[PDB]
Amino acid sequence: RDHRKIGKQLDLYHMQEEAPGMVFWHNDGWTIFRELEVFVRSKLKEYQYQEVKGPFMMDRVLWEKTGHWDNYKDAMFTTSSENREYCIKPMNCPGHVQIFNQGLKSYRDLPLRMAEFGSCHRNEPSGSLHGLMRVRGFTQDDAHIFCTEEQIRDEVNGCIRLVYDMYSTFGFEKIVVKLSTRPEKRIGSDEMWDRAEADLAVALEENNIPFEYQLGEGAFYGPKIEFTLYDCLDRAWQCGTVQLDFSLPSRLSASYVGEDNERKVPVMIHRAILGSMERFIGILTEEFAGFFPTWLAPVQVVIMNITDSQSEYVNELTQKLSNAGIRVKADLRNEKIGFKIREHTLRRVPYMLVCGDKEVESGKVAVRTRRGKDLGSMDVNEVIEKLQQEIRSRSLKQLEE
C-alpha cells in the first residue's frame, strides 16, 4: 500500500529532480486536498476560529528575535532583495503574532483562535525525504490560540478534543500519543518549562490518554503533544500536535490589557490537527489503499452509455447529479462498456452508473461499485439522495456494505 505507487496509479501527484521534496498536485490529488480543507473549515467554524493568511517571507531580523535563527537556521531557506535578507517561513506563528499585534487587545478578546492553512518550507536533508510524508514544502492546518494562563486548561482540552473529533471521521484504529519535553537548545527558563510540561501532562491524563515521554524532543519554544499515525510498514509519523508556548509572544512584543487594566503577555498554544496536508494524505492513501471514502474521492460517480443511443440520457443525468453537488463525469467515449468500467474501477471511482436502452426507457440507472458490487437498477432520485447522505455524513462505507 505504498502511497507513492498509488499516487502515480491514481494520478494524484508527482515529484521531480528539479524540485526535491516539492509536490506537484494533479487535479485529482488537489481535489482530495481541497475536500480536506472544507472539512477543516467546517470544524474551524464549529470550534470558533478566525482564518487568516500571512506572508511567504519576512526579514531575517524578525526570525532572529523569535529564536528561529539561532535554533532553526539550518532548516530555513533564505533569499534577498535590495540588500535585505529574508527567510521563507518554516512556521506560521510569527506572522500570526504580527496580525495579533495590529490593534489594541483586551482580555475580552481572549481566547483568540487564529487558524491558517499555512504553506511552510523547510530545508530538510534530501536523504530524509520520503514521498508525501517528509517534504520540503507543505501546508499545515495550523492555528495559534492566544489566551490567559487561566484559559490554558480549557484551550488545550479543546485542541485535544478537536483531534479525536476529526480523526474519528477516518476510522483510525491506531493513534499513539507522546509528550516531548525540553530539548537541548531552547528558549525560556526552566521554571516556565516545568509549568508547561506539567500543563500538557495534566491535559493528557484528564483526557484519559495513555502517553509516553519523548525526552528532549520538544520544540525550542515549548513542549509538545504528538499524535502519531502509522503507514503501511508501521513507521511512525507525527501528525497532529499541540505545543505550549510562554516565550514567543513576549519576544515579539505581544500584549493585552488585563481585567486589572495592567499590560499582560498572552500565552500561545500552537496546534495542527492533521499536521500537514501532504503527510496526512500520505497516511490516508495507505490506510485506504486508494479506496478513498466517497466524500473524499476525486471523482465520485462516472456515468457511461452502452452506445451512442444513450448519450443524451447520460448527459442529462450527469448535469442532474452535478447540480446536486456530486463530483460526476460522463464517459461517452467510443469504447466497449466493459473497457470503460474497468478503467474507472482501477481508478477507484466509488460508483459507476451504466445506461442501456432499458435504463433510458425506465428513467433508472444500473449501479455498480469499485469493489465489484452490483446494486442493480435504481431510481435516479433514490441514488442522488443516497449519495448526498453518504457525502454529507462523510461516511466510511458505501451503499450497503
What is the nearest approach in angstroms of ligand SSA to the Cβ of residue 190? 22
Amino acid at 307: T
159 marked as part of a ligand binding site? no
Closest CB to a copy of itself among 114 and 354? 114
148 marked as part of a ligand binding site? no
Phi-psi bin for 91: left (phi > 0), alpha (psi -120 to 50), beta? beta
Which residues 6+ apart lie within 8 Å of 297 measured at CB?
327, 348, 349, 350
Residue 136 is a catalytic residue: no
What is the nearest approach in angstroms of a copy of itself to the Cβ of residue 265? 20
Which residues 6+ apart lie within 8 Å of 36 measured at CB?
141, 274, 277, 280, 281, 296
Per DSSP bridges, beta strands 328-331 and 301-305 are: parallel
- Site mask, a copy of itself, residues 74-103, x = CB under 8 A? ---xxxxxx---x-x------x--xx--xx
Q: Which three cell numbers stand for residue 303?
A: 456515468
Name the active-site residue from 96, 121, 141, 142: 142
Closest CB to a copy of itself among 281 and 366? 281
Determine the interface stretch with Zn ion among 37-45, 89-97, 278-286, 299-307 (rule: CB under 5 A).
89-97
Amino acid at 115: A
Q: Is 93 a binder of Zn ion (CB under 5 A)?
A: yes
81 marked as part of a ligand binding site? no
Q: Is 140 a binder of a copy of itself (CB under 8 A)?
A: no
What is the nearest approach in angstroms of a copy of itself to the Cβ of residue 281? 12
Per DSSP bridges, beta strands 301-305 and 351-355 are: parallel
CA distances from 72 to 151, 287, 395 (A): 29, 32, 41
What is the nearest approach in angstroms of Zn ion to the Cβ of residue 202? 21
Q: Enumerate binding residues for ligand SSA (CB under 6 A).
A: 91, 93, 122, 124, 134-135, 138, 140, 142, 238-239, 241, 270, 272, 275-276, 278-279
Closest CB to a copy of itself among 16 and 208? 16
Q: Is 89 a binder of Zn ion (CB under 5 A)?
A: no
Residue 159 is a catalytic residue: no
Name 211's bridge partners: 177
Question: Alpha carbon 109 to chain centroid distance?
Answer: 27
Question: Alpha carbon 40 to chain centroid distance?
Answer: 7
What is the nearest approach in angstroms of a copy of itself to the Cβ of residue 69? 13
Residue-by-residue DSSP string for 184-229: SS--S-HHHHHHHHHHHHHHHHHTT--EEEETT-SBTTB-EEEEEE
Closest CB to ligand SSA among 114 and 349? 114
Closest alpha carbon to 232 in 289, 175, 164: 289
Site for a copy of itself in 57-76 (CB under 8 A): 57-59, 61-62
Q: Which of 1, 5, 14, 153 binds a copy of itself (CB under 8 A)?
A: 14
Name 304's bridge partners: 331, 354
Name the active-site residue from 60, 144, 178, 182: 144
Closest CB to Zn ion among 39 and 72? 72
What is the nearest approach in angstroms of ligand SSA to the Cβ of residue 93? 5
What is the nearest approach in angstroms of a copy of itself to the Cβ of residue 120? 10
Closest CB to ligand SSA among 115 and 302? 115
Quick check: 23 and 13 in contact, CB under 8 A? Answer: yes
Q: Is 19 a binder of a copy of itself (CB under 8 A)?
A: yes
Which residues 6+ apart lie within 8 Å of 200 measured at CB?
156, 179, 223, 224, 225, 242, 244
Residue 9 is a catalytic residue: no
354 marked as part of a ligand binding site? yes
User: Kind and range of the H or E element at 329?
Assistant: strand 328-331
Residue 121 is a catalytic residue: no
Q: Which of 3, 68, 251, 270 binds Zn ion (CB under 5 A)?
A: 270
Tally of CA atoms within 13 A in the half-sphere of 47 that contains its CB: 26
Which residues 6+ apart lie within 8 Å of 128 measured at CB?
134
Contact residues toward a copy of itself (CB under 8 A) are 11, 14, 16-20, 22-27, 30-31, 33-34, 50-59, 61-62, 77-82, 86, 88, 95, 98-99, 102-103, 114, 119, 121, 123, 125-126, 136-137
Known binding-site residue numbers for tRNA: 72-76, 122, 134, 221, 243, 306-308, 334-342, 348, 354-359, 368
Q: Which residues are identified as catalytic?
A: 93, 122, 140, 142, 144, 224, 270
- In the complex, which residues of this chain contact Zn ion (CB under 5 A)? 93, 270
